[PDB]
Amino acid sequence: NNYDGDTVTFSPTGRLFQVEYALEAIKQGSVTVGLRSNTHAVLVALKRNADELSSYQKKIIKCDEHMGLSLAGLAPDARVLSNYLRQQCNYSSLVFNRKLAVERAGHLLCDKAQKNTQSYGGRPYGVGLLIIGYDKSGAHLLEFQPSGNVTELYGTAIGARSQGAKTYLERTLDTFIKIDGNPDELIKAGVEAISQSLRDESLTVDNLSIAIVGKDTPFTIYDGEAVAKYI
Amino acid sequence: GSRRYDSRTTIFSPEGRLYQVEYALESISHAGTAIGIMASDGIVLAAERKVTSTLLEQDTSTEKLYKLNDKIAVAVAGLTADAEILINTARIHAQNYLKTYNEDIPVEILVRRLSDIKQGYTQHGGLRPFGVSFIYAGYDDRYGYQLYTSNPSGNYTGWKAISVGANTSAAQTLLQMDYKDDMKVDDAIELALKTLSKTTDSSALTYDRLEFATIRKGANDGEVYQKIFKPQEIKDILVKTGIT
Amino acid sequence: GYDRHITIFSPEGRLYQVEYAFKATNQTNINSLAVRGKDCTVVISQKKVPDKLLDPTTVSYIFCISRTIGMVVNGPIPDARNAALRAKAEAAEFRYKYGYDMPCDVLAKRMANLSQIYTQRAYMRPLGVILTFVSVDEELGPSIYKTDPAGYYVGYKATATGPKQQEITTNLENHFKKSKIDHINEESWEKVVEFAITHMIDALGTEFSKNDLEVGVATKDKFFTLSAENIEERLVAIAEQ
Amino acid sequence: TGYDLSNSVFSPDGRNFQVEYAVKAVENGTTSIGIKCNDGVVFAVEKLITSKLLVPQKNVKIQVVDRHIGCVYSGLIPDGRHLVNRGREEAASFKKLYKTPIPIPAFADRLGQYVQAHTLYNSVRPFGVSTIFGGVDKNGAHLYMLEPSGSYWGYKGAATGKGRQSAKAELEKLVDHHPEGLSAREAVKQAAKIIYLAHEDNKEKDFELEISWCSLSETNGLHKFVKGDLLQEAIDFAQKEIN
Amino acid sequence: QFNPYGDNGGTILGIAGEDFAVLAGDTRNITDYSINSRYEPKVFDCGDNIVMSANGFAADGDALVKRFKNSVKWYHFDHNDKKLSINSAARNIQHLLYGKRFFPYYVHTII
Amino acid sequence: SDPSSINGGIVVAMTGKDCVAIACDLRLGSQSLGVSNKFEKIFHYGHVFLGITGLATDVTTLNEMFRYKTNLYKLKEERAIEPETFTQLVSSSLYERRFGPYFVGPVVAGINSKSGKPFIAGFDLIGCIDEAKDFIVSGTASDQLFGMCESLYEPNLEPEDLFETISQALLNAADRDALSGWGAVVYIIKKDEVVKRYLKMRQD
Amino acid sequence: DRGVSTFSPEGRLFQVEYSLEAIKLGSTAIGIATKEGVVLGVEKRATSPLLESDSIEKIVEIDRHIGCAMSGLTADARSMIEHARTAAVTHNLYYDEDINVESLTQSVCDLALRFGELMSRPFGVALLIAGHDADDGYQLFHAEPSGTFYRYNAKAIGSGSEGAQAELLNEWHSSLTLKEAELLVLKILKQVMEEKLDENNAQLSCITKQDGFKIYDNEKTAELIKELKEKEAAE
Amino acid sequence: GYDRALSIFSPDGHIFQVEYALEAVKRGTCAVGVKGKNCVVLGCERRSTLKLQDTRITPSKVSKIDSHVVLSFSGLNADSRILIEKARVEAQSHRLTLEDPVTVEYLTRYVAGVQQRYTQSGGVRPFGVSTLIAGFDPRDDEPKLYQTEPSGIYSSWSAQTIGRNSKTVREFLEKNYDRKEPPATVEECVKLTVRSLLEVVQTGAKNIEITVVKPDSDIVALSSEEINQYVTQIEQEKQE
Amino acid sequence: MTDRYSFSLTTFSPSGKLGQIDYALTAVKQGVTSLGIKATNGVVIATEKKSSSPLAMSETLSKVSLLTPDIGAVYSGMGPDYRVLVDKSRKVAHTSYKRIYGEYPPTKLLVSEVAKIMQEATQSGGVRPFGVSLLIAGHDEFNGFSLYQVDPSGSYFPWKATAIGKGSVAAKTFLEKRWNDELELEDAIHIALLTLKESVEGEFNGDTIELAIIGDENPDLLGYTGIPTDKGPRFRKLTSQEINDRLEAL
Amino acid sequence: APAX
Ligand SMILES: [Cl-]
Ligand SMILES: [Mg+2]
């Protein structure tokens, strides 16, 4: 209230309101879901449009052949952060001939976001990210929030009404976690998870966005007629 | 951060005035009056000291009148310390011009650069303006004798006669009344002192509350001389015009 | 009143942030005291370890700045250590630049100047500390010089600092009134330490065990602090007196 | 007033309210502890299980510095990571210039000075963590706890977070009941118990235990995580005691 | 005096047909009168149906190829996965090379 | 390629009874080619006189520089700079350019207006002060000037005698140097009158 | 006061939201995308009849294959256009090809959030960016000061936008010819404009693959205006 | 460096510092520009609460930027010097690199760009000045008149006025200026300019300045009598 | 991090006062009285050494400082501010004068440099004005003896005699009665000692009074011989004993 | 430059 003027100010109960307001833009964001088995990891995102004459804002960005993410909240902030990830993955290849661990990607994003929560003049990032990838220790899903908190999960979801999907995934856990060697089944489960977050709307062909990465699949994105298979 | 404590010295009021310039001008209006009068054969600078104590060393003193080069001097109304900063800048600027062109700096050119410096403090940098108004008195071979004033806004204008500091309203009315174009220097000397005598907030004008300077062609043939009056010389010129 | 948050003048010509920095000086509730012998300078300070979980050996407000200079702080420990690290760096640099050991009084002046800057430049806060520097200077002999958040410093015959400082001060003034001299007329530093502890006991009206105190001694060519045992040895001798 | 709106401002009592507010963020966080032992140190922390979906064992919170130092913290997790990153640079540069690995007291002051630095200006915010850290150097074992103000001391045992009081009481008992010293493997078990006991004050969500240690004899003076049979064994010892 | 260049020998050759093109190079790598390797490839698949060799000073050759491969990667990232045409690759490589006009890559490049 | 002998020229200064003299030639050339016959090398700042030999561009630059510095000095100090003080200012200014110097051989001469003492000094290109009772020499014919001065000079000459002596030292030194000559000027300086005489000399 | 980069409690950037208000006060700009081209039309809105209206430049070339219309604080757009042109020409220098419309738009949008305490505030102008490229054909983009851009089949910006957008919603279909789209932009402009639409206070432009970006002269536009009244009268 | 964002947006979408800069222009002395068939005339009011002025040396209100282009203004006088200097430097730089003097549009666009830059740069306030820029492109005889303002927007005008009571004189010009028939000569155009100023000014004494610009660098300032004649001649046609 | 205070902390109020300068002068008002008197063959500057505790050794705290061998300074106001000004004043005498001209600056010019420093603390970003007024007494060959007062604003004035701080109003009146242009230096010392008793509460002796002169050259204080044109410092601090000698004949 |  008097303590929300900037990120460099704690409230008397030890809160950071600008960081909390940044978290709020994520909540207004269109829903997106992450989930993984032991062989693959999948992102599903509901794309949002301006009106019926407009495109449906992309929510999924490729970071490397083995890594990529989905976004919820401020899109330019996802562009900045995904671009940083591309560089970090890149640097790992050129210098060490090493594909960047998804866990390190997580740590690097956390530390980048954190700097903007402790210095005057900056501002926190206004976007949440779900990072998937396949590396030397298998499939991974991460959840990034602009407080700097990054968390590794079997599955999750973020954005408006993401609580529906996050509940569904919480029950479904024992099933989807063991969809190994079957891309299309893992995706189906992801599409069902996101459906628990729909209201007055359902998944159309230019509305749904899916991505998959895993053992012998480079991170690739499916849009348009390529997702009709799944509706 | 530190934004909390920033007065924002370089912004507009809703009326489109510069607060700090206005308030600086308000400060200057309580300063000792200084008068410049321009004749056909020279210029007078006269200024009233901020009210003396009997123990002040008055002869080795300078508060109002400063030499910029051999052909240009200024009279100050406002913060002395602020003025000295600007005076040394102006003195250096004069020398750069001479060094570059092997010719003494034209009066306006010097005046413009000083005024341009002041202007800058009102538009960028977030610093307070200089609380100073100058009367410039000088000679050059383009325009001859010239009087200018500049103020914290960095606006400058030229004059036949002008006052700055305290009671300029009364002083300007009196100069307007008695000034006339064909005037000699010695008449302008008298007008300057008579004007201060009537506008002063003191009981009576004495030698020890004044600074005085002339810029004449009154050396030898087609060249110019600055005379900064000694106390005894002011005491005499005060008698010579019957104010004491 | 934003003249209360940064180090600019108030209408009555005061610096509230400097004044409030002085109040932080007593936050720890410790009292310190320093006296000069013939050959030495002694500084003692109360040692209070509240929590049973603390490692008592790491709890100290006395610092060895150089081989010859010691410094005791009255104030919170983060500011105290900040000041000590700087003093150590300044004393080492001085030695390298000028080829001789930094004198106690010159270090005091230097730290005082640094403090003065924080009272004038807005972006730096004052440190909530009072620094008492002690040595046996090769030119000036036993020396005590003290710095505060205002950037003030001065040399002392003896001094005290803390909440119950005034008691200790007048106690010491009354001694020097009587003794008629500048210092503790004593040969060994062991007895000067004993004097220091003794007059601290009278002025504060409290007894001390070996773990209630903390002692630093400066002699010609070394400053050192005492162990719990050297202090116990010292408390024992005061009791047999 | 308004003294509490800007870091590095003294209030009229002589306090920096912004540091005090950072302490509230620390008190709000999960419980973490350290126990100093015969020839080393032990670190433990409670990881709240927000959901079934957190991959167990795979959100590691204890962090190593150099090869011989462990760090754990309660409060704002990213602030702690930032502090450890700086610690790693401080240790690297020490080792670079002086060859030997950084001594623990030396390391403690490096963090202390850096944290204290963030209470000097209004253009930065204090750290929202209390950090427990330590290890083994040429002079033996050291345990330290460091607060948002920059204040740190050496500890026999230390605790912070929501269960700090419960844990503190439990530590005080060990210090009294083991005055000749506690062994490394003893401390590992005790640490598990105390985290389970201090989990009382945070008990909506059940938790995951995480332990690490440096011991001159048990880990050769290097920081290692406790896993497998040793972790499960210490969990079991803790389970015994809350029943 | 330190000489930042060396010469790794070998030779390369490109021929273009109507609906195909070849880029060939020997696999020998040398310095002075010594053989470093009898099989060290210097012709590379760079993606988007472009092959590239940069022959002469191998260290410079490898650096350049690495930079171009990376250039192809970012071309996809920045222009919606668009295919990098051979004419566009060529022009991009000119800028890579000329960017070091005053400390050149000692290579003869063929794509 | 030696900047101190591209243009050529000389300066000499001498003390007498309550007077000083300073003289220079008027040649400015570009190696063998004589270009100007009017290039004076002596300047004054109030009552202090400065002669400068060496690279002509630096001679001009330094004159402009010391005019600048003495003008500001006068405005701030409210008095004319004295020779002892000016000598120090010359030294500071040259040494400030220690590793990229002005290729000059300056010479200062004048009478201190408080003490009445005659004063001369010479400098190397990087500021080293050479104060002397008797004479200072500078330029491409400095060897010759040293020879002429050391034999011709005697202490306490009257202004009109000093004039003859310094003139003969300059003239005969110039005539044994290919790069000096083409005219000459002599300043006779007394406590408050200064006479400037142009000498008639061989024009080859 | 309060930081320029501050979030509201709803999680929006105050300064970005306020710049969106400035854009609502701007003169109307409309674009329609067809398979035969993209039309861009704007309301000139001369503030006084003495001002020579042809000097009002709110439609602007970026490259031969990309055009731009603006609405809001139009002086803020100069540097955006300058950046766009440089980005387009530079790309052609580095790659010997035409730069994609989306890539161009993304480059301009990267400028948007580079403000703080970089520039001192967001831009107070929205852009309609229209072009053609071989990959994705004819395109229309709405570029906001938030850094966000949306592709549209048709879009209106400025004061008359909510009225005009509802109208474009009804009229747009996937088979509009270019000529139909030109008329439609003219029609919708006349509806939302204060003063009466003529060839001096509105302006038209298109970009086609074949002839690139062209701004229409007043003679050509006047005839499409005349053709539009005769279409409406006749039913 | 001093960094503060002084020109920022308010909740209604206004930039108050730019709008307040406009208020400073409104308070400034009146300036008017009228373009004939073959000339452009710049008229400027001078506020007459000032006698003892020295007009020889007092900064005139119309400034030559190059020998074929002039600039006048209303608003803060000190601010206007900065824009004029920058404009003058750019004029010479354009000649140096393009080997051609500036077009009036180009020079206007430059000045406008400077003004805009000061509305979204940290640590600076906007220029409290609007300008009228007039002249003829090189080797062209079609007259040009442009106006700029603090926000940075600029445009071309058949005739225009700025400063105090500019709405009164814009009112005048709007009913008295025929787009179809612009003042066919110098004499004609100067008159219309003086008439419009007489709506607002006072006496046409030492109150009005006029500067005429014809093609190929032909710029001349009228002096008192030459203007005075115009004043005299209009009031004698007024009693009707 | 770093100084983000690049804006002025001293600004004009609507009445035209510069608040921080006024408030700095108020801090000078609070300060202990100090004074200076100019004789025909010397200048005297004096002040009270008002000790903080009697355990403090107040010889270690010098309120009157040598700036050059012919120039001295004293102050009223905040001591720490004065200390760093003396440091800066000593250095600027070298860097901006002695290293250029090979001689020490004349009084007015050194004063001018100190004034510049104090003016900059009145306008530069992120600083407050100095909370002191200085009195600078000095001698130079072409100006003779002089006395200057420097205020927080950066303004300075030459005085025959004046006083600053606590009881300045009273002390200035006292000095108007006693001062004439024929005072020999010993007379000025005597008047200074009388003037100072009015404003001192407690002990009044050579241990509580600090007093220095600018007078004759002191060859015995030079430290070396053999350059006959170097004659020694005109600045001399009177000893505790020297003061007490003049207090018995008071 | 001279030497010593
Ligand atoms: Cl210092
Ligand atoms: Mg010859």
DSSP assignment of F19-86, as one string? EEEEEEE--EEETTEEEES----EEEETTEEEEEEE-HHHHHHHHHHHHHHHHHHHHHHSSPPPHHHH
DSSP assignment of chain D, as one string? --GGGSTTPPPTTS--HHHHHHHHHHHTS--EEEEEETTEEEEEEEEE---TTBPTT-S---EEETTTEEEEEEE-HHHHHHHHHHHHHHHHHHHHHHSSPPPHHHHHHHHHHHHHHTTS-TTB---SEEEEEEEEETTEEEEEEE-TTS-EEEBSEEEESTTHHHHHHHHHHHHHH-TT---HHHHHHHHHHHHHHHGGGG-SS-EEEEEEEEETTTTTT-EEE--HHHHHHHHHHHHHHH-
* Count of alpha carbons within 13 angstroms of residue C200, beta-carbon side: 30
- Under a CB-based contact definition with an 8 Å cutoff, are residues I162 and I149 in contact? yes
Q: G162 burial class (0-12, 13-18, 19+ CB within 10 angstroms)?
A: exposed
- DSSP annotation of B53 reads -
Q: What angle do CA B102, B103, B105 make, to 5 degrees?
A: 130
The CA dihedral of A131, A134, A137, A138, to the nearest 10 degrees, is 100
CB contact, 8 Å: F64 with chain B? yes
For G171-210, give one letter per residue: b (16+ CB within 10 A) or e: ebeeebebebbbbbbbbbbbebbeeebebbbbbbbbbbee
For helices C165-179 and C189-204, angle between their N-to-C axes, nearest 10 degrees: 130
Q: B5, C123: Cβ pair inside 8 Å?
A: no
CB contact, 8 Å: J3 with chain F? no
Among the partner-chain residues F77, F92, F114, the one whose CB lies closest to the CB of I99 is F92
Q: G135, E80: Cβ pair inside 8 Å?
A: yes
* The CATH number of domain D1-243, selected from 2.40.50.180, 3.20.20.70, 3.60.20.10, 3.40.190.10: 3.60.20.10
CATH class of domain segment(s) F1-204: alpha beta
Ligand 1 midpoint to CA I91 (Å): 12
Query: Are 3 or more Cβ–Cβ pairs between A and B shorter than 8 Å?
Result: yes
- Under a CB-based contact definition with an 8 Å cutoff, are residues G186 and G202 in contact? yes
Dihedral sign from CA coordinates of C153, C155, C161, C166:
negative
Which residues 4-23 of H are in CB contact (within 8 Å) with I? 4
Alpha-carbon gap, residue H164 to D53, rounded angstroms:
71
Ligand 2 midpoint to CA F1 (Å): 21
Short-list I171, I194, I201, CA closest to I243: I194
- Under a CB-based contact definition with an 8 Å cutoff, are residues G6 and A123 in contact? yes
Short-list I49, I34, I223, CA closest to I147: I34
Chain J residue numbers touching F126 (CB-CB < 8 A)? 1
Tokens of B140: 């050059």
Tokens of B157: 């204008």
The CA-to-CA distance between both ends of chain C, in Å, stands at 57
Tokens of C155: 């040399």
Mutate to test the interface with G, among A24, A53, A58, A120 (most CBs of G within 10 A): A53
Query: Are 3 or more Cβ–Cβ pairs between I and B shorter than 8 Å?
Result: yes
Taking the CB of residue H220, how many other CB atoms lie within 10 A of it?
12
Chain A residue numbers touching B2 (CB-CB < 8 A)? 120
Ligand 2 midpoint to CA F186 (Å): 22
Among the partner-chain residues C9, C122, C123, the one whose CB lies closest to the CB of I24 is C9
Instruction: Set out the domains of chain G in order of their start, with CATH numbers.
Output: 1-235 (3.60.20.10)
The CA dihedral of C186, C191, C196, C202, to the nearest 10 degrees, is -110
- DSSP annotation of G152 reads B
Alpha-carbon gap, residue D32 to D210, rounded angstroms:
10
Alpha-carbon gap, residue F144 to F181, rounded angstroms:
13
Sheet bearing F104-111, strands edge to edge: F42-45, F48-54, F104-111, F118-123, F129-131
Q: What angle do CA F166, F168, F171 make, to 5 degrees?
A: 105
Short-list G92, G97, G94, CA closest to E94: G94
Q: Give domain limits for chain A.
A: 1-231
The residue to which tokens 């022009």 are assigned = E91
Dihedral sign from CA coordinates of I209, I214, I220, I222:
positive
Query: Are 3 or more Cβ–Cβ pairs between F and B shorter than 8 Å?
Result: yes
Chain H residue numbers touching I7 (CB-CB < 8 A)? 2, 4
One-letter identity of residue C104: C
- Under a CB-based contact definition with an 8 Å cutoff, are residues H79 and H118 in contact? no
Alpha-carbon gap, residue A25 to F100, rounded angstroms:
62
Q: Please give the interface size between A and E, counted as residue pairs whose CB atoms are below 8 Å apart.
A: 6
Q: I103, F85: Cβ pair inside 8 Å?
A: yes
CB contact, 8 Å: B232 with chain H? no
Among the partner-chain residues C112, C121, C169, the one whose CB lies closest to the CB of I80 is C112
Chain I residue numbers touching B25 (CB-CB < 8 A)? 16
Instruction: Set out the domains of chain I in order of their start, with CATH numbers.
Output: 1-250 (3.60.20.10)
CA distances to C59, D10, E11, E22 from C23, rounded to whole Å, are 22, 9, 81, 83
Catalytic residues of D, which ones? 30
Closest ligand relative to C117 C-alpha: 1
Q: What are chain I's partners, defined as 3 or more CB pairs within 8 angstroms?
A: B, C, D, F, H
Alpha-carbon gap, residue C84 to C62, rounded angstroms:
9
CB contact, 8 Å: B124 with chain F? no
Dihedral sign from CA coordinates of G193, G194, G199, G205:
negative
Chain D residue numbers touching A169 (CB-CB < 8 A)? 53
CB contact, 8 Å: I101 with chain F? yes
- Under a CB-based contact definition with an 8 Å cutoff, are residues E48 and E83 in contact? yes
* Closest residue in A to D25 (Cα–Cα): A14
Ligand 2 midpoint to CA F180 (Å): 10
CB contact, 8 Å: E70 with chain A? yes
* Closest residue in I to H1 (Cα–Cα): I6
Closest ligand relative to C106 C-alpha: 1
Mutate to test the interface with D, among C5, C29, C114, C118 (most CBs of D within 10 A): C5
Alpha-carbon gap, residue F120 to F131, rounded angstroms:
6
Taking the CB of residue C12, how many other CB atoms lie within 10 A of it?
11
3-class secondary structure per residue, H63-94: EEEECCEEEEEEECHHHHHHHHHHHHHHHHHH
Q: C5, B2: Cβ pair inside 8 Å?
A: no
CA distances to A103, C218, E7, E90 from E25, rounded to whole Å, are 41, 80, 16, 19
Q: A94, E70: Cβ pair inside 8 Å?
A: yes
Chain C residue numbers touching I83 (CB-CB < 8 A)? 109, 112-113, 116, 151
Chain I residue numbers touching C154 (CB-CB < 8 A)? 52, 56-58, 60-61
Method: X-ray
Taking the CB of residue D133, how many other CB atoms lie within 10 A of it?
29
Tell me which residue range forms the domain holding B128. Answer: 1-244
H-helix or E-strand containing F164? helix F159-174
Closest ligand relative to C90 C-alpha: 1
* The CATH number of domain C1-241, selected from 3.40.50.720, 2.60.40.10, 3.60.20.10, 2.60.120.10: 3.60.20.10
CB contact, 8 Å: D221 with chain A? no
* Closest residue in F to B100 (Cα–Cα): F64
H-helix or E-strand containing C203? helix C189-204
Short-list G86, G135, G131, CA closest to G108: G86
Taking the CB of residue D100, how many other CB atoms lie within 10 A of it?
11
Query: What is the tally of structural domains in chain B?
Result: 1
- Under a CB-based contact definition with an 8 Å cutoff, are residues C163 and C203 in contact? no
Question: Which long-range contacts (C-beta less than 8 Å, at least 24 apart) are formed by B47-51?
Answer: B47/B75, B47/B76, B47/B77, B47/B165, B47/B210, B47/B211, B47/B212, B48/B165, B48/B166, B48/B196, B48/B200, B48/B202, B48/B205, B48/B209, B48/B210, B49/B208, B49/B209, B49/B210, B49/B211, B51/B202, B51/B209
- Under a CB-based contact definition with an 8 Å cutoff, are residues I82 and I247 in contact? no
CA distances to B65, B111, D135, D221, E43 from D140, rounded to whole Å, are 76, 75, 8, 9, 58
Short-list A123, G112, B128, C7, CA closest to H2: B128
Chain J residue numbers touching F125 (CB-CB < 8 A)? 1
Alpha-carbon gap, residue B3 to A231, rounded angstroms:
54
Distance from CA of B147 to the nearest CA of H (A): 8
Q: Give domain limits for chain F.
A: 1-204
- Under a CB-based contact definition with an 8 Å cutoff, are residues I155 and I115 in contact? yes
CA distances to C92, G93, I132, I165 from I135, rounded to whole Å, are 36, 70, 10, 11
- DSSP annotation of C58 reads G
CA distances to A49, G71, G109, G112 from G125, rounded to whole Å, are 21, 6, 12, 10
H-helix or E-strand containing F143? helix F142-152
Q: What is the CATH number of domain A1-231?
A: 3.60.20.10
Closest ligand relative to C107 C-alpha: 1
The residue to which tokens 């009134």 are assigned = C177
CA distances to E89, F189, H57, I26 from G98, rounded to whole Å, are 14, 81, 58, 72
Q: A86, E77: Cβ pair inside 8 Å?
A: yes
The CA-to-CA distance between both ends of chain H, in Å, stands at 64
- Under a CB-based contact definition with an 8 Å cutoff, are residues B160 and H55 in contact? no
- DSSP annotation of C26 reads T
Q: G121, H15: Cβ pair inside 8 Å?
A: yes
CB contact, 8 Å: B175 with chain I? no
Q: What angle do CA C21, C22, C25 make, to 5 degrees?
A: 95
The CA-to-CA distance between both ends of chain A, in Å, stands at 45
Alpha-carbon gap, residue E14 to B152, rounded angstroms:
75
Rg (CA), chain G: 18
Closest ligand relative to F202 C-alpha: 2
CB contact, 8 Å: B217 with chain F? no
Distance from CA of I23 to the nearest CA of C (A): 5
3-class secondary structure per residue, chain I: CCCCCCCECCCECCCCCEHHHHHHHHHHHHCCCEEEEECCCCEEEEEECCCCCCCEECCCCCCCEEEECCEEEEEEECHHHHHHHHHHHHHHHHHHHHHHHCCCCCHHHHHHHHHHHHHHCCCCECECCCCEEEEEEEEECCCEEEEEEECCCCCEEEECEEEECCCHHHHHHHHHHHCCCCCCHHHHHHHHHHHHHHHCCCCCCCCCEEEEEECCCCHHHCCCCCCCCCCCCCEEECCHHHHHHHHHCC
Alpha-carbon gap, residue A58 to A222, rounded angstroms:
11
Chain C residue numbers touching B2 (CB-CB < 8 A)? 122-123
H-helix or E-strand containing B93? helix B80-101
Alpha-carbon gap, residue A38 to A181, rounded angstroms:
9
Q: I109, F89: Cβ pair inside 8 Å?
A: no
